[PDB]
Design an enzyme around this catalytic site. Structure first.
Site, PDB file in Angstrom:
ATOM      1  N   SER B   1       0.842  -1.230   0.000  1.00 34.24           N
ATOM      2  CA  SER B   1       0.000   0.000   0.000  1.00 34.24           C
ATOM      3  C   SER B   1       0.860   1.256   0.000  1.00 34.24           C
ATOM      4  O   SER B   1       1.980   1.254   0.513  1.00 34.24           O
ATOM      5  CB  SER B   1      -0.898   0.017   1.240  1.00 34.24           C
ATOM      6  OG  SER B   1      -1.593  -1.208   1.377  1.00 34.24           O
ATOM      7  N   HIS B  23      -2.967  -1.852  -1.009  1.00 42.38           N
ATOM      8  CA  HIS B  23      -2.713  -3.010  -1.867  1.00 42.38           C
ATOM      9  C   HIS B  23      -3.090  -4.287  -1.135  1.00 42.38           C
ATOM     10  O   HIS B  23      -2.535  -4.587  -0.078  1.00 42.38           O
ATOM     11  CB  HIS B  23      -1.236  -3.111  -2.264  1.00 42.38           C
ATOM     12  CG  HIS B  23      -0.717  -1.915  -2.995  1.00 42.38           C
ATOM     13  ND1 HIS B  23      -1.488  -1.185  -3.871  1.00 42.38           N
ATOM     14  CD2 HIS B  23       0.508  -1.335  -2.995  1.00 42.38           C
ATOM     15  CE1 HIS B  23      -0.764  -0.201  -4.376  1.00 42.38           C
ATOM     16  NE2 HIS B  23       0.451  -0.271  -3.860  1.00 42.38           N
ATOM     17  N   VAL B  70      -0.334  -1.174   5.934  1.00 38.19           N
ATOM     18  CA  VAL B  70       0.060  -2.147   6.936  1.00 38.19           C
ATOM     19  C   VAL B  70       1.444  -1.792   7.474  1.00 38.19           C
ATOM     20  O   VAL B  70       2.356  -1.494   6.697  1.00 38.19           O
ATOM     21  CB  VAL B  70       0.070  -3.565   6.318  1.00 38.19           C
ATOM     22  CG1 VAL B  70       0.949  -4.512   7.135  1.00 38.19           C
ATOM     23  CG2 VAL B  70      -1.361  -4.090   6.242  1.00 38.19           C
ATOM     24  N   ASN B 244       4.668   0.916   3.205  1.00 41.17           N
ATOM     25  CA  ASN B 244       4.957  -0.287   3.983  1.00 41.17           C
ATOM     26  C   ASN B 244       6.383  -0.335   4.503  1.00 41.17           C
ATOM     27  O   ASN B 244       6.781  -1.300   5.146  1.00 41.17           O
ATOM     28  CB  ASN B 244       4.680  -1.549   3.162  1.00 41.17           C
ATOM     29  CG  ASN B 244       3.239  -1.639   2.707  1.00 41.17           C
ATOM     30  OD1 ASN B 244       2.313  -1.552   3.517  1.00 41.17           O
ATOM     31  ND2 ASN B 244       3.041  -1.814   1.411  1.00 41.17           N
ATOM     32  N   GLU B 455      -3.133  -2.669  -6.895  1.00 39.60           N
ATOM     33  CA  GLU B 455      -4.088  -1.567  -6.925  1.00 39.60           C
ATOM     34  C   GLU B 455      -5.508  -2.094  -6.726  1.00 39.60           C
ATOM     35  O   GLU B 455      -5.924  -3.046  -7.383  1.00 39.60           O
ATOM     36  CB  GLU B 455      -4.034  -0.823  -8.270  1.00 39.60           C
ATOM     37  CG  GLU B 455      -2.672  -0.245  -8.675  1.00 39.60           C
ATOM     38  CD  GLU B 455      -2.160   0.835  -7.732  1.00 39.60           C
ATOM     39  OE1 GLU B 455      -1.209   0.560  -6.978  1.00 39.60           O
ATOM     40  OE2 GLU B 455      -2.700   1.960  -7.746  1.00 39.60           O
TER      41      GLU B 455
END
Lengths: 152, 520
Positions: B1, B23, B70, B244, B455
């Site tokens: 992400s 993501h 995350v 991330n 995506e």
């Protein structure tokens, strides 16, 4: 300077656009959450009911061996019961929103039984606690503590 | 992400910008995102969230907006138990387990159910599980006493000011995630959020492994307050980001360093090439407009190529095998971008799988190791060009075997297929440097592959008055059998043709295709 004037909905209604995006208008918070639950059931009802079923710790009961490992993982970690506790521990205002959300999902299924896959019909009706259980499973027992890391 | 928040001063119009770009798997049911818009007399929220969740995690409105990535907050500990005499050894003494006899039903092939016994054992640490190898592990999860996760998100996204937003976050009811924020008032913020156990020793690696479950020495009981976690608000650099990567380069220049926090909060491992691109794209651009902001999100650079081809090509050209030479020239003429028409991209990937491992995260093959002192320009070079060329030799075989040729167009093999829509793909693996991500699956018998992750919900928002936002959902807004809203957005995704997101009543009314009245 100041944001644009907010819209004051005078009736409960969902206005769907050409891509299936729901614009939920409610006269109050509970109504909006209800419409949100209805919309989600419309767009993703089958998988949501299935997930809620698992969060109850009844995956093995409802669907068999393929869902038994998760059932053992969630029951051993007391997720379904803790969900009941967290639900009761919610503030009155927010618990009413969760109840409305679950009610929205049940209402959609009630009015559109043909859109609900046979295998997940046994999950209905859902409750505010079911909503809390799934979120609890997703946050704490999927993202934070995954069965893979504990079991290997 | 990915996540970007840009401060007013770094923009052309003077309004903050925000990018929501998570993501996740395109198939995992609980990871499916759903787009929606809620409006009441007291609040308005627009955005995406995982199906089944009653609150919008990726939201924005006329006032503010947030996004999540995350961060892997270590909110749980797995302890290795030393079984002895029916119990487990703890602080020099054998402790008895707490034991509860439960049961659950198992559906049979004939529709009936069989009652199955389930013993739930617990040590002082928490529930106990037995691994296949026979290892007894007790899992201790933090934050089991934080029932307000959902309400915190709700109060965060409906917050009337950053102060109220922070107050909500301070409740510490959301156990994980990096959260980025931006508002019309011009404030941007990055927070390394989560419920982290207070520990007196051990680095993150230690706490991520099997911690000794035979001593109270490792039994934590308290968690860190929001003030103890890495956070950044309105930095000198005028932006915050997270792809991330560890929270050590959330902005440029940085505002803190690893030594400023306990070593068990986050890893201090090399930042992926995608994360390095994230920092570069924001820091190198100024006077940003919403349009330019969006254009930057489309970046699909084969950064890995910039770090390796300068050393790889010359070494490969001197190899006796003419096919290796031809491969070297093909790779040499490549502009190093993952475009649909690229004839070298697939081959480069195959090489990188060997040079840097299947996940492309390997570091052993670079000449110059990663350094936090040069966070967006290391690692670099090829340590052993000879071996690297042998790897290319093998990659040449792998490419032909998988795709039928060493120069098949990237977009001819990489396709985005949903229902009867089949369009050419572009962009690619994040660890190779592609900012916009599409984690291509292994190819089928004809060399065709599709996204397995990447995506999903993508939105860029400018907090002007009124706000302006654009977005797309890779796999549509529905997955119910027969819906016409599953594959109706993938074609636009293939052209990066974003939809304007409609928050104003007049816009919604002009776009409405179906009206559902309801009563609660």
């Amino acid at each position: 300077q100041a944001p644009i004037a907010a819209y004051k909905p005078r009736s409960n209604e969902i206005l769907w656009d050409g891509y299936g995006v729901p614009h939920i208008y409610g006269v109050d918070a509970p109504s909006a959450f209800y419409g949100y639950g209805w919309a989600q059931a419309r767009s993703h009802g089958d998988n949501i009911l299935r997930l809620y079923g698992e969060a109850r710790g009844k995956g093995a009961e409802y669907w068999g061996p393929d869902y038994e490992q998760t059932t053992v993982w969630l029951l051993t970690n007391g997720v379904p019961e803790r969900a009941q506790q967290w639900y009761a521990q919610q503030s009155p205002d927010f618990r009413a929103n969760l109840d409305a959300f679950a009610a929205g999902i049940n209402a959609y299924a009630q009015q559109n039984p043909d859109d609900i896959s046979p295998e997940v019909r046994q999950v209905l009706p859902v409750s505010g606690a079911d909503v809390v259980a799934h979120a609890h499973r997703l946050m704490n027992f999927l993202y934070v503590a995954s069965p893979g890391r504990t079991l290997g | 992400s990915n996540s970007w928040a840009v401060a007013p001063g770094k923009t052309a119009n003077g309004n903050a910008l925000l990018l929501q770009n998570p993501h996740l798997s395109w198939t995992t049911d609980y990871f499916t995102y759903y787009e929606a818009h809620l409006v009441t007399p007291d609040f308005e929220i627009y955005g995406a969230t995982q199906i089944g969740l009653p609150v919008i995690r990726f939201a924005f409105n006329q006032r503010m907006g947030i996004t999540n990535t995350v961060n892997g907050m270590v909110g749980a500990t797995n302890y290795r138990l030393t079984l002895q005499d029916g119990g487990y050894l703890y602080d020099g003494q054998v402790r008895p387990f707490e034991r509860r006899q439960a049961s659950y039903r198992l559906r049979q092939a004939d529709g009936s159910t069989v009652d199955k016994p389930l013993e739930i054992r617990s040590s002082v640490h928490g529930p106990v599980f037995e691994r296949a190898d026979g290892t007894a592990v007790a899992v201790r999860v933090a934050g089991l006493d934080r029932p307000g996760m959902l309400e915190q998100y709700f109060d965060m996204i409906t917050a009337h000011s950053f102060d109220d937003y922070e107050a909500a976050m301070a409740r510490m009811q959301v156990p994980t995630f990096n959260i980025v924020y931006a508002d019309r008032e011009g404030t941007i913020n990055y927070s390394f959020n989560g419920v982290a156990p207070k520990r007196a020793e051990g680095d993150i690696a230690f706490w991520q492994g099997n911690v000794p479950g035979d001593s109270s020495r490792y039994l934590w009981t308290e968690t860190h307050p929001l003030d103890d976690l890495p956070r950044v608000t309105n930095p000198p650099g005028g932006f915050v980001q997270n792809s991330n990567d560890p929270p050590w380069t959330p902005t440029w220049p940085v505002t803190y360093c690893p030594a400023n926090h306990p070593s068990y909060l986050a890893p201090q491992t090399p930042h992926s090439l995608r994360a390095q691109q994230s920092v570069r794209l924001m820091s190198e651009n100024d006077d940003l407009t919403l349009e330019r902001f969006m254009a930057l999100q489309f970046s699909h650079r084969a950064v890995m190529a910039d770090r390796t081809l300068p050393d790889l090509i010359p070494a490969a050209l001197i190899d006796p095998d003419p096919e290796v030479q031809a491969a070297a020239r093909l790779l040499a003429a490549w502009d190093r971008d993952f475009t649909s028409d690229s004839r070298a991209a697939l081959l480069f990937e195959e090489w990188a799988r060997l040079f840097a491992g299947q996940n492309f995260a390997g570091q052993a093959a670079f000449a110059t190791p990663w350094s936090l002192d040069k966070p967006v320009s290391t690692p670099y070079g090829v340590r052993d060009p000879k071996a690297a060329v042998d790897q290319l030799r093998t990659a040449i075989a792998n490419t032909k075997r998988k795709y039928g040729a060493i120069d098949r167009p990237f977009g001819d093999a990489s396709r985005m297929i949903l229902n009867d829509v089949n369009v050419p793909g572009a962009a690619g693996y994040g660890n190779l440097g592609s900012f916009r991500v599409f984690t291509w699956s292994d190819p089928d018998e004809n060399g065709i592959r599709t996204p397995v992750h990447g995506e999903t919900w993508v939105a860029m928002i400018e907090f002007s008055t009124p706000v302006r936002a654009y977005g797309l959902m890779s796999y549509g807004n529905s997955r119910q059998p027969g819906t016409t809203h599953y594959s109706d957005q993938i074609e636009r995704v293939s052209r990066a043709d974003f939809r304007e997101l409609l928050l104003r009543r007049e816009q919604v009314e002009a776009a409405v295709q179906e009206r559902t009245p309801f009563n609660f």
